[PDB]
Nucleic acid binder design. Structure first.
Ligand code: 2TM
Ligand code: MG
Ligand code: MG
Lengths: 51, 717
RNA sequence: AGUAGUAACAAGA
RNA sequence: UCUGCUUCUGCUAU
RNA sequence: AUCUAUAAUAGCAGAAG
């Protein structure tokens, strides 16, 4: 969480090179979900050993 | 610049950097599915190399058996299984003529071995085919199941405890009308042919974690009816191999390197100055698939000439059983339907009455080629040795072909000698010119062809004498160090903290001694092992910050201790090891530096993490508290009925050890039952105690009365 | 999909 | 329905 | 000087074929 906070310059993620045999919206949603859950357990500042 | 590590060989000879060519830092290849494909392909290759042989039907099993002996001499350089019996007998005769008395002395020692060996020897095996369950089981479990079934069928010669009496029981079991299997209680009855096929079966599995191979292959494990005979035959062949200078077996390690160096040195000394000397680094192709059991029988019959007949019989049974052996096909296959999204297991036992539409091209061809041999889910495999089952006897055959290379047998100007380890071989050829070298190589190759040995042309090469490779030992005017091969031995072993420390440090030291591990690299290996150990066991230095569940106790113990240098690494202490003290254990290395209370706690006589033995008074423990026992999870099938049998077994064995103090130090011997031995021991002990004066009238009477009660209970259940 | 590579995993009871 | 045989080496003591 | 051996407890781990 701290190492991510050291970076300013986040944008809205968009697909640049798709996985031609996969479902790329799923990857976009997975990254959005990672960001959302990180924001969740950071807003708590009760950060477990595992999420 | 483009980095090319291989270019390092332009200045450093390949031998002096051979360790670079061994990529043993990555994981080895494993098998994922079934081994039926490799088993069927092995059977088909074995029958292809011997296809010009004679087909027969076994009157006892009903299996089609192929006999390539004395078949047509090969016409090409493809692998051939057509060994000529007269050439094998000539090789044996000339080996005995060149080393007078080798077979006689070997047979004497092997007679002693056969008469003294106990049936317990069979328990020294790994996963064994168990015909009672038709599955792989630990060797001791398979042997116990076999003994129980034999006893319930009236076969009880194995009660003598001798291996040869158990072999007599096996011989008599192969003559019964029906075999009774009593499971848990379902009473199954095998008939003669079914029991016979189960007794001649070798289960087949795929070999895992194998380096140097792109493709997987099959290994075999025989049942208990085969293993005693194979053990006696291998003991005879080992006695023979010990007396031969060309044998790379059973010598291993530093002794093997010394023997190879000395023998090659003597060979170069014997070669005259005017002669041309060449060396073949040679492999043999399809070694086990072309080693015929009939030729092993011929070899054993020639070796055991003028011996007692019982000895010849007991040594002849293993080649006979291997000549009529069956290879179990394995787990079968797995079928998937994508459209229905389902998967199913098809057993191997239904691979003869199945539709071929389900299979791809190559598997369908395999099944079509192997179907005539299928009986009860096994394939008839008369030719072949089925993967290193007679390593030492095949070594003897190869050494006989090497021995045929003296000038008294070549009768020409060229001659040859060398080293033979089962299939691997180093052949030194001497001749006055290059044409003589070619003639000697051709003659050796064709003589090998005559006895079923096929030199691998693509894996073998020849050069002027002085450099060669033998059994992954690289010889450049002397054997070089190859450290990479011993690389997987470095690391945490997973026994416990004490044992892992001991193993890590000892491995580093022995690699300094044997594998040219330099001192600086040894110090770095020590550092890396300590890092991996501290990570694995959560025992980082007390004065650190790594966060773990153990770190609080370690910090408390650290701050509590005056002399920190005495704490063990597992207790968060420092690492005091260096090149100086690798041979010294860790508790002894820092015994002087320990605090008295920490020392008396670590080595407390009533340590609760180790087992205590009764003398409720118990002996004092000696080991430290770092010698704890790791929980072994063994919890989803129907084979849960043996957990109670094993528990009661353990109860009985602990009681016996309470009656016999040395039973766990040395293996106990005796034909008497457990209750009889324990009661007689209790009686004689009570007698010599009342006599010498440790017990009185009444205690002696009570002990004798309990003994009489137990004896009437054993006679009267 | 992916791992993987001559047969499997992508949970099973 | 799944780590075989053989040889060497190392460690440990249910 | 010899010494797998004028020898034989067992289990596990590594290597080789
Ligand atoms: N694990 C092992 C490895 C080897 N062995 C024994 O060593 C022989 C040569 O193996 P090898 O591995 O040299 C045969 P390879 O060179 O792969 O192929 P090729 O036969 O086409 O030449 C086998 O046939 C077995 O007797 C064993 O019993 N267990
Ligand atoms: Mg070779
Ligand atoms: Mg090879």
């Amino acid at each position: 969480i701290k190492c991510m906070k050291t970076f300013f310059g986040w944008k809205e993620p968009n697909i640049i090179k798709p996985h031609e045999k996969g479902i790329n919206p799923n990857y976009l949603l997975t990254w959005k979900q990672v960001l959302a859950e990180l924001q969740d357990i950071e807003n708590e500042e009760k950060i477990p050993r595992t999420k | 610049m483009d980095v090319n590590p291989t270019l390092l060989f332009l200045k450093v000879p390949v031998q002096n950097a051979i360790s670079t060519t061994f990529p043993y830092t990555g994981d080895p290849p494993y098998s994922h599915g079934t081994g039926t494909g490799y088993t069927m392909d092995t059977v088909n290759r074995t029958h292809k190399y011997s296809e010009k042989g004679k087909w027969t039907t076994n009157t006892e099993t009903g299996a089609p058996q192929l006999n390539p002996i004395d078949g047509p001499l090969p016409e090409d350089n493809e692998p051939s299984g057509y060994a000529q019996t007269d050439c094998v007998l000539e090789a044996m005769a000339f080996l005995e003529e060149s080393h007078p008395g080798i077979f006689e002395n070997s047979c004497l020692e092997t007679m002693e071995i056969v008469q003294q060996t106990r049936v317990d020897k069979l328990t020294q095996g790994r996963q064994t085919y168990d015909w009672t369950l038709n599955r792989n089981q630990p060797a001791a479990t398979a042997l116990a199941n076999t003994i129980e079934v034999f006893r319930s069928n009236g076969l009880t010669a194995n009660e003598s405890g001798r291996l040869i009496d158990f072999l007599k029981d096996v011989m008599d079991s192969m003559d019964k009308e029906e075999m009774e299997i009593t499971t848990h209680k379902k009473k199954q009855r095998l008939n003669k042919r079914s029991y016979l096929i189960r007794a001649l079966t070798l289960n087949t599995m795929t070999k895992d974690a194998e380096r140097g191979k792109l493709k997987r292959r099959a290994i075999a494990t025989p049942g208990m009816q085969i293993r005693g005979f194979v053990y006696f035959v291998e003991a005879l062949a080992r006695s023979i191999c010990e007396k031969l200078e060309q044998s790379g077996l059973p010598v291993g390690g530093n002794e093997k390197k010394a023997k190879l160096a000395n023998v090659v040195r003597k060979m170069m000394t014997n070669s005259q100055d005017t002669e041309l000397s060449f060396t073949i680094t040679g492999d043999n192709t399809k070694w086990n698939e072309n080693q015929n059991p009939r030729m092993f029988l011929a070899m054993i019959t020639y070796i055991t000439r003028n011996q007692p007949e019982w000895f010849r019989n007991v040594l002849s049974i293993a080649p006979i059983m291997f000549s009529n052996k069956m290879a179990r096909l394995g787990k079968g296959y797995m079928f998937e339907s994508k459209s229905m999204k389902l998967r199913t297991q098809v057993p191997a036992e239904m691979l003869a009455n199945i539709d071929l539409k389900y299979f791809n091209k190559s598997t369908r061809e395999k099944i079509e080629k192997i179907r005539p041999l299928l009986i009860d889910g096994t394939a008839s495999l008369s030719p072949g040795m089925m993967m290193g089952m007679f390593n030492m006897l095949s070594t003897v055959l190869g050494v006989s072909i090497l021995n045929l290379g003296q000038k008294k047998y070549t009768k020409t100007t060229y001659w040859w000698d060398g080293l033979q380890s089962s299939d691997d071989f180093a052949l030194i050829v001497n001749a006055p010119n290059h044409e003589g070298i070619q003639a000697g190589v051709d003659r050796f190759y064709r003589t090998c062809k005559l006895v079923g040995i096929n030199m691998s042309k693509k894996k073998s090469y020849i050069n002027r004498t002085g450099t060669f490779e033998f059994t992954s030992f690289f010889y450049r005017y002397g054997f070089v160090a190859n450290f990479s091969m011993e690389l997987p031995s470095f690391g945490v072993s997973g026994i416990n903290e004490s044992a892992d420390m001991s193993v890590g440090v000892t491995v580093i030291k022995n690699n300094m001694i044997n594998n040219d591990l330099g001192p600086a690299t040894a110090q770095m290996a020590l550092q890396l092992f300590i890092k991996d150990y501290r990570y694995t066991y959560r025992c980082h230095r007390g004065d650190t910050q790594i966060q773990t569940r153990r770190a609080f106790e370690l910090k408390k113990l650290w701050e509590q201790t005056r002399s920190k240098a005495g704490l063990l690494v597992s207790d968060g202490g420092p690492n005091l090891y260096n090149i100086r003290n690798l041979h010294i254990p860790e508790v002894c290395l820092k015994w002087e530096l320990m605090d008295e209370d920490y020392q008396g706690r670590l080595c407390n006589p009533m340590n609760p993490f180790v087992s205590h033995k009764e003398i409720s008074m118990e002996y004092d423990a000696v080991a430290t508290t770092h010698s704890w026992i790791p929980k072994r999870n063994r919890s989803n099938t129907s084979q849960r009925g043996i957990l109670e049998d094993e528990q009661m077994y353990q109860k009985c064995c602990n009681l016996f050890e309470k009656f016999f103090p040395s039973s766990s130090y040395r293996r106990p011997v005796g034909i008497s039952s457990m209750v009889e031995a324990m009661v007689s021991r209790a009686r004689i002990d009570a007698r010599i105690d009342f006599e010498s004066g440790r017990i009185k009238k009444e205690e002696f009477a009570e002990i004798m009365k309990i003994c009489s009660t137990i004896e009437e209970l054993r006679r009267q259940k």
